[PDB]
Structures are given as C-alpha cells and as structure tokens.
C-alpha cells in the first residue's frame, strides 16, 4: 500500500527544480571553500533503505534488535575513520553519529565542559565558526555562547592567529576548552603552541579541522592528532563525503572521555542515528585512504597555490599574501569595493564565492574580502593551468564591479540595478558557462 512511481511522474514539480539545480551546478565555477561534489556511490548510500532502521545506542549496545547489519556498518565506519586519520584504535576513538558539524561541536563541547562551562574560540569576523562561541554586542548568537560562557580571540593585523593574545586571554579568562581550526583561515595552524597554552591553564585542546580535513589525513599539513584532546570534522567539505560529522577523542590523554563523548551525542542531544549518512561516510572514508585521494588532495593544494599566484600577478591583494591550504581570502581595499558587491557580481556570471572579513574590518557589517577555495573545481578536473582563467575571470569581475559602482553609487540596492542585462557580464557568464558546462561532473 504505497506509490512506487518514479520521482519524475509522482512529483514533476519538484523534479523540475531539481533538474535545474543540477544544471546550475554543472554550469558554475564553484569557489565556495566549503563545498564539493559527491560521487554517485556516496549518493546511492544516501538513498539506501538502511535509513528505515531505528538504531538508538551504539554497536552491540543497541536499545532495539535486528541491528546486526547496522552494527557492522557503524563499526566499519569507525574503523575506516581512524585508519584515514592515521590513528590507532588503541589511543583514539571516533563517534560517527553526529548529524552535522554544528551538532558535533555542540555535543563534543558539552561533553568536555557541561552547561555554564567556559570555552575559547576564534571570533567569527576573524574566521572562527559560529559554534566556536559566537556572540554579538546585542545577542548570544550561537548556543555555544549561551549554553557555555565563551570568550573570542582574534587575528593580528597580518591575518595570523595572535598566539600571544591567545595566551593573555587564556590565563586571564581560564577556559576549560580552547578551540582552534577555522572556517576561513588560509594558513596552517600551530597546534603545538596551542597544546602548550592549554597546559598552563589546564584546558582541553579542541581542533575543528572540517576545512582542512583531507590535508590532515594525507599528511600534507600539521597533525592536530599529535596534540589535541578532541578533533572534529565535517565529512562534506574537502573530505568530499556526505553531509555529516566526526568526533575524535584522545582516550590515552583522557580516560573517561570515550563514554563522555558517546553519551553527549546519545542520549543527551541526538536520537536515532541516520544510518544512510553513516553508510555514505563509510563509502567515502574508504576512498580517502587510497593514494588516488592523496593525488586529489595534492591537486587541491597545487590549484590553490597556482590561483593565489595568478591573482597576485594581476595585482590583487590576499590576506597573509598567500595560502598554505585550499582557501584564499582576497582583500578588496585597493579597489574600494566590498565583498558583498563582488559576491553580487560573481552571482551574475555563474561564479560562486562568498564575502568575508579582513583584519582591518571593524565589524562584520561591511566585509572587505571574498573567500574562494579550490576543492569543488579540483573535483571537476581543473588543473593548475586552469587557475589562470579563473583568476582572469575574477579580475574581470572585480573591474566590472568597480565600473558599476562608479555608475550607480555606493549603496548596495543602488549598485545592484546595474547587473541585469549588462553586456559585459553576459559575455563573461557565457565564457564561464561554456567552460564550466563541459568540465567532468559527478
């Protein structure tokens, strides 16, 4: 007693929008640093009947029965997880149930510090994530600043984490967790120095490596597992998995942490796990361990260097004047345009990127930068030589943005009337669609 008609027939209206999304993705130069494209196998797992099953609890420790095949799936996933991040089942454990990065962080921070607990994170306007304790002058914007008591550190004038400021605050404010690992940070992290600062205050060291996860697994960037108590990562960004998250925990440094983390996830915060997610992670984490994935991650960094370089050759400024990872933050000051304006211009030419603060920005009000990243385009086949064109396109978009602003004024609503039907943007869009359209597409 059900309807087994294909999606096309049963719900034409939805299928049509979906058919469109797919075309927008196919015909876009996607530079959203946090985005990627899943392969067909990952998507088969996501659409698998394994999500019919309720599986509250942990393997061999379920509330319901008939969970043996589910238990294998979850245990496979924990195993492939620890292997990928080059850690022994004996020193580290992982929880693979968190539905997403924000959930994982909240769950893991609660596990460590409880309600009214003290945490330190990087400010959002400086490149920290919302769940690193974000609050405003007027509001406790993230639960992490409300259920916890948080203090936020900043970057210096050159766009680097000010470790000396981290220390001043940590001794003065006395957190039980210090979070490092960022949403928008173009450079590698000195985890050793974080590990040393925590020790003077007795704090835990939390590394959120969602943006650089593949670099960590592939031994291309600094290893946080060498120093940290907890490591979290989403599975969907550079890692190229489904939308999900991982919590890693150092048993050796902390006996009692395993049950603390597993209990935080369920039953404090979550109910039934989404087993299709757990399955999709398994599928991808296997791909991750292969030398082919190491190729890809290397290719990611090469494109990112070639891109930063090409932009500089076009006299465009970058925060920290470079990148060690997959992401670049462009500084727009020398052109007197905002990131929102350029975001608007890139939107019109099928170039996806986002506005972003620079140190010299007082508030999150008027971002002076844009964040671009190379994982999505690398997946689609772009090589170092293709970074020229992309840089060429962003330079052209910046120039058009500067022209439109002189014509239509400083206010965004005013600025925005220039875009529709602009001969230059339509020519540029066409160049983009034409190049993007024919790129390999999972």
Ligand X SMILES: Cc1[nH]nc2c1[C@](c1cc(C#N)cc(-c3cccc(F)c3)c1)(C1CCC1)C(C#N)=C(N)O2
Q: Which is nearer to ligand PLG, 208 or 229 (CB)?
A: 208
Q: Helices 275-289 and 291-313 sit at what angle, rounded to 10 degrees?
A: 80
Quick check: 254 binds a copy of itself (CB under 8 A)? Answer: no
Nearer to ligand PLG, 77 or 207 (CB): 207
In the complex with ligand PLG, which residue's Cβ is closer, 210 or 345?
Answer: 210
Of 159-188, which residues contact ligand X (CB under 6 A)? 183-184
Q: Verify whether residue 89 is a known catalytic residue.
A: no
Among residues 356, 368, 374, 401, the one that binds ligand X under rule CB under 6 A: 356
Please confirm, yes or no, whether 243 is among the known catalytic residues.
Answer: yes
Of 27, 110, 111, 208, the one binding ligand PLG (CB under 6 A) is: 208
Mark whether 341 is an active-site residue.
no
141 near ligand X, rule: CB under 6 A: yes
Residue whose tokens read 């620079």: 358
Residue 12 annotated as catalytic: no
Q: Is 129 annotated as a binding residue?
A: yes
Q: Quick check: 360 and 246 in contact, CB under 8 A?
A: no
* 26 labeled binding residue: no
- The catalytic position among 35, 56, 384, 392 is 56
Q: Which of residues 32-51 bind ligand X (CB under 6 A)?
A: none
How far is Cα 343 from Cα 370, in angstroms, rounded to an integer?
8
* Of 48, 100, 298, 340, the one binding ligand PLG by CB under 6 A: 100
Dist. CA 408–CA 415, nearest whole Å: 5
Nearer to a copy of itself, 188 or 258 (CB): 258
Among ligand X, ligand PLG, a copy of itself, none, what does residue 29 contact (CB within 5–8 Å per kind)? none
* 371 in Cβ contact with 351 (< 8 Å): no
Instruction: Find which of ligand PLG, a copy of itself, ligand X, none residue 36 binds, CB within 5 to 8 Å per kind.
Output: a copy of itself
Q: What is the largest CA-CA distance in the chain?
A: 68
Interacting residues of 47 by C-beta distance below 8 A, sequence separation 6+: 276
By beta-carbon proximity to ligand PLG, the closer residue of 175 and 181 is 181
Whether 54 has a binding-site annotation, put simply, is yes
Stretch that binds ligand PLG, among 90-98, 175-183, 339-347, 399-407 (CB under 6 A): 175-183
| By the rule CB under 8 A, 346 interacts with a copy of itself | yes
Kindly state whether residue 286 participates in binding a copy of itself, applying the rule CB under 8 A.
yes
Q: Does residue 69 belong to the site contacting a copy of itself (CB under 8 A)?
A: yes
Q: Does 277 bind ligand PLG (CB under 6 A)?
A: no
Q: Return d(Cα 321, Cα 319) in angstroms, integer.
A: 5
Contact status, residue 421 vs residue 407, Cβ threshold 8 Å: no
From 81, 84, 104, 124, residue interacting with ligand X (rule: CB under 6 A): 124
Q: Could you confirm whether 380 is annotated as catalytic? A: no
363 is catalytic: no
143 near a copy of itself (CB under 8 A): yes
Give the one entry of ligand PLG, ligand X, a copy of itself, none that residue 211 binds, where binding means its C-beta sits below a cut-off of 5 to 8 angstroms depending on kind: ligand PLG
In whole angstroms, what is the distance from residue 50 CA to residue 30 CA? 32
Interacting residues toward ligand X by CB under 6 A: 56, 63, 124-125, 127-130, 141, 183-184, 267, 271, 354-357, 364, 367, 371
Report, as residue numbers or ranges, the catalytic residues.
Answer: 54, 56, 208, 234, 237, 243
Annotated binding site for pyridoxal 5'-phosphate: 54, 100-102, 129, 183, 211, 236, 243, 272
């Amino acid at each position: 007693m059900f309807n087994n008609e294909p999606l096309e027939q049963i719900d034409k209206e939805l299928h049509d929008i979906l058919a469109d999304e797919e075309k927008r993705q196919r015909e876009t130069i996607n530079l959203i640093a946090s985005e990627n494209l899943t392969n067909g196998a990952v998507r088969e797992c996501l659409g698998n009947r394994v999500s019919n099953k309720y599986s509250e609890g942990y393997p061999k420790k379920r509330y319901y029965g008939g969970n043996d095949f589910i238990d294998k799936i979850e245990e496979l996933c924990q195993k492939r997880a620890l292997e990928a991040f080059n850690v022994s089942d004996e020193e580290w454990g992982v929880n693979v149930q968190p539905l997403s990065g924000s959930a994982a962080n909240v769950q893991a921070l609660y596990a460590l510090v409880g309600v009214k607990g003290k945490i330190m994170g990087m400010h959002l306007c400086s490149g920290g994530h919302l769940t690193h304790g974000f609050f405003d002058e007027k509001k406790k914007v993230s639960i992490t600043s409300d259920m916890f008591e948080s203090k936020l550190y900043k970057c210096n004038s050159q766009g680097y984490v000010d470790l000396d400021a981290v220390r001043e605050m940590a001794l003065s404010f006395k957190p039980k967790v210090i979070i490092c690992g960022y949403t928008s940070y173009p450079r590698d992290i000195d985890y050793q120095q974080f590990r040393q600062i925590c020790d003077e205050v007795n704090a835990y060291l939390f590394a959120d490596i969602s943006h650089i996860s593949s670099f960590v697994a592939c031994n291309i960037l600094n290893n946080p597992f060498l120093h940290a108590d907890v490591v979290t990562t989403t599975t969907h960004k550079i890692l190229r998995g489904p939308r999900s998250a991982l919590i890693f925990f150092n048993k050796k440094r902390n006996p009692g942490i395993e049950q603390k983390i597993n209990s935080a996830v369920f039953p404090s915060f979550q109910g039934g796990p989404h087993n299709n997610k757990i399955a999709a992670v398994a599928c991808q984490l296997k791909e991750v361990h292969s030398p082919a994935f190491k190729e890809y991650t290397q290719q990611v960094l090469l494109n990112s260097k070639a891109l930063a370089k090409a932009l500089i050759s076009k006299q465009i400024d970058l925060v920290t004047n470079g990148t060690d990872n997959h992401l670049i933050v462009v500084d727009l000051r020398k052109f007197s345009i905002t990131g929102s304006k350029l975001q608007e211009t890139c939107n019109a030419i099928n170039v996806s990127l986002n506005k972003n603060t620079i140190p010299s920005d007082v508030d999150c009000v008027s971002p002076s930068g844009v964040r671009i990243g190379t994982p999505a385009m690398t997946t689609r086949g772009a090589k170092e030589k293709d970074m020229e064109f992309i840089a060429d396109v962003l330079a052209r978009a910046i120039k058009i943005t500067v022209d439109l602003q002189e014509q239509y004024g400083k206010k965004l609503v005013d600025f925005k009337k220039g875009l529709p039907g602009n001969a230059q943007l339509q020519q540029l869009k066409q160049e983009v669609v034409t190049w993007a359209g024919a790129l390999p597409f999972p």
